[PDB]
């Protein structure tokens, strides 16, 4: 990927003012910043500034001050190390699609990192002690994956190959990258196996503590060490239904009409069942 | 919650020194600091200091250098980014009491900012890679919990309520927040419901990994997932008497004279039964 | 332990170089740096400097700069906040011996500090939010640890003697320092114990989210809570053979030679069977 989460933002909302540095500076604030300008926060003000906390501990002691109060969550004010944090619009993580109000851990930012996440949707919570590994190779004499730091261009090629060929996928290796629909839940101390997973279903909940070795079906429960099938949030009629109103996607135009809809499942399919 | 765990230490043990900063000081550092007088540490001396550690990375420099050797552990310095760290006094973690010698990673400490904890115990050990995290709602078409954002005052309204009536309660909404006893033990990769756990007894043992979805009684051993009774730790005799005694809100007094007793249980209850 | 994983490249690798910080530095890093000349990056050159970026997130910002696409991955930069990472030569982490190109988070390196570990093998690859933490005493009125800040010189003796004759071992009291073997994977989440476990043999995989309480013989694969033997990785000819050959401890010399064997277990033992 290319560019910030700081930077989408900055790019739709600074509309002419300056960056307000909430914090110590690192390297890599200082460079995204150098399109803009900026300075050390001193006296704020939401018509003159908009305020760059470096670090959610930076952004707490913000919000905590008597000058945060007028400032709205993105669009005057944002956290520069949150990489995973939501946003009221659509944006890139890397270069992985994450939709509105949608947020994870750095676990998940890596997975985006290593080309592990092709797609990630709409209202999803992923906890951020999280986790998307892949695996190594199993029909190997060795298990490691740094010894290839040893290997010359010749061995690098013999040792490439065999990877694209094993058709268990270490380090998702000629698979394709797994999705994660919309309205998902994912507990904490969790694993999706990147190299044997391509989809969870919207609506998918993954319970704590639960390792994901297959794909989630929509709106289906998974729990246990492996994951299981515990339940489904819903009667099947509603899961039909719900990947056909695709209720994630609406603006925020239906989101607030249709509350009554949203909040009471009875209702929901009242109105479009 | 209000004050730092450091500014605590400081207004207890500060005692007219300056505080000595050993590390690159931070926006909420140099807040908490703005009561004293500081500066950054060069040569140091405990009468004339209070040294104050950033990180933990930072403290490690510290004790390592010679310096430290006539600084006691909180008297003379502390780690301010350390807000789960031990003390010798009855502290608080935002609005939670916490008792003497009692520590938990952020997990907790962010917890204690929910108001998901009511109150920690005393000689409590909980790891840093613990959990507690509450549920979102179940009843509802979404799971999502950050489409509230989206939400205008009217949907507000008929969203929060539901909440409040749901009695699986989702973000721990209409209960009473959770208690930890006193002689606790918790594994890590751990995970305590605050959406459906309100007691940890005295003295309950949480094993590695394990997930506890209820509240577990005070000596009681849990591990697996979910969270299952392998044994408790003392004879039923021993909970009620320990219970009546409650070593834990002894004194420094009692502690060291009864050392025969708190060491040998067979010798605790031959003084005590 | 004594001395830095940086230092230990800067020893070997500096060759009359200057240090070119990228990144703010730190107290514990300007300390490492204090037998050598450095200043903070501006414009670098592999000839003139050695680049030591502070974070692994300065490590991303460095590597994303056109300048270091000339920087070898350790002979001529590395990441100061990784003591886990791997390096090319067998290396020291604190007092403990780690082969080559073998990694670990810093779960690891505080069993390393808190002298748990006895060695780790080469080509080893563990997790960073893999765990090794030992037990508190189980057969005691208490279970807490920092009690013991509360106890005199008196009741220290009483309670150190009662920790060193205990067999169950807290602390890993009385014990050998495990040990990891080579060509080890140890999946995420994961818990070996330091009061129970003394050996992780050669090739052994350890699932993510299992928490391994006793030995785990070489070459076999353990998942679940608690860890169970879910199948052996080779064929019991392989395996003494393979402790036979020891690969791990080969040369960059038979590495590249017998990639061809090293790739295809069934090659491996038609060359060395
Ligand atoms: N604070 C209580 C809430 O915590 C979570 O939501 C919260 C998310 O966890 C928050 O996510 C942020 O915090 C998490 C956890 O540290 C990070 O993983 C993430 N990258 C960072 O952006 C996000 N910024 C706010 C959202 N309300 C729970 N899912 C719901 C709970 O009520
Ligand atoms: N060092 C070995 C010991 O580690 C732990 O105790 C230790 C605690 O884990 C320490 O807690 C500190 O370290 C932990 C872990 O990083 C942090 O979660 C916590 N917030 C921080 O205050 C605390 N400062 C010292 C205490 N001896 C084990 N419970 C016992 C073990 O012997
Ligand atoms: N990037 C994808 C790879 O991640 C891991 O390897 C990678 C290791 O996890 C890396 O280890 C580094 O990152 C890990 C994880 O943050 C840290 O625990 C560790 N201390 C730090 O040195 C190390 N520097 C590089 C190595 N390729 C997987 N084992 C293999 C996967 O293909």
Same mark, same amino acid.
């Given at each position: 990927?290319?560019?910030? $989460? &700081?930077?989408?933002? !900055?790019?739709?909302?600074?509309?002419?003012?300056?960056?307000? *540095?909430?914090?110590?500076?690192?390297? $890599? &604030?200082?460079?995204? !910043?150098?399109?803009?300008?900026?300075?050390?926060?001193?006296? *704020?003000?939401?018509?003159?500034?908009?305020?760059?906390?470096?670090?959610?501990?930076?952004?707490?002691?913000?919000?905590?001050?008597?000058?945060?109060?007028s400032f709205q969550y993105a669009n005057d004010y944002l956290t520069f190390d949150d990489e995973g944090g939501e946003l009221p619009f659509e944006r890139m993580c890397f270069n992985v699609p994450v939709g509105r109000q949608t947020y994870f851990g750095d676990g998940v930012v890596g997975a985006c990192e290593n080309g592990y996440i092709k797609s990630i949707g709409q209202f999803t919570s992923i906890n951020g002690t999280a986790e998307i590994h892949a695996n190594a190779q199993l029909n190997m004499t060795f298990v490691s994956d740094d010894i290839q730091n040893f290997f010359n261009e010749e061995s690098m090629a013999v040792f490439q190959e065999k990877l694209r060929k094993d058709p268990k996928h270490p380090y998702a290796y000629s698979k394709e990258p797994m999705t994660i629909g919309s309205d998902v839940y994912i507990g904490a101390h969790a694993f999706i196996n990147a190299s044997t997973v391509t989809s969870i279903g919207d609506g998918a909940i993954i319970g704590s503590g639960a390792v994901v070795l297959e794909?989630?079906?929509?709106?289906?429960?998974?729990?246990?060490?492996?994951?299981?099938?515990?339940?489904?949030?819903?009667?099947?009629?509603?899961?039909?239904?719900?990947?056909?109103?695709?209720?994630?996607?609406?603006?925020?135009?239906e989101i607030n009409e249709n509350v009554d809809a949203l909040i009471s499942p009875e209702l929901f399919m009242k109105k479009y069942g």
């Open positions: 990927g290319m560019k910030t $989460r &700081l930077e989408q933002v !900055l790019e739709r909302y600074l509309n002419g003012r300056e960056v307000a *540095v909430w914090g110590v500076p690192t390297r $890599r &604030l200082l460079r995204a !910043l150098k399109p803009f300008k900026f300075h050390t926060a001193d006296r *704020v003000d939401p018509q003159y500034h908009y305020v760059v906390a470096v670090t959610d501990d930076d952004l707490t002691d913000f919000l905590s001050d008597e000058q945060s109060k794909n989630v079906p929509p709106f289906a429960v998974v729990v246990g060490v492996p994951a299981r099938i515990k339940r489904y949030r819903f009667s099947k009629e509603m899961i039909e239904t719900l990947l056909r109103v695709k209720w994630w996607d609406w603006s925020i135009e």
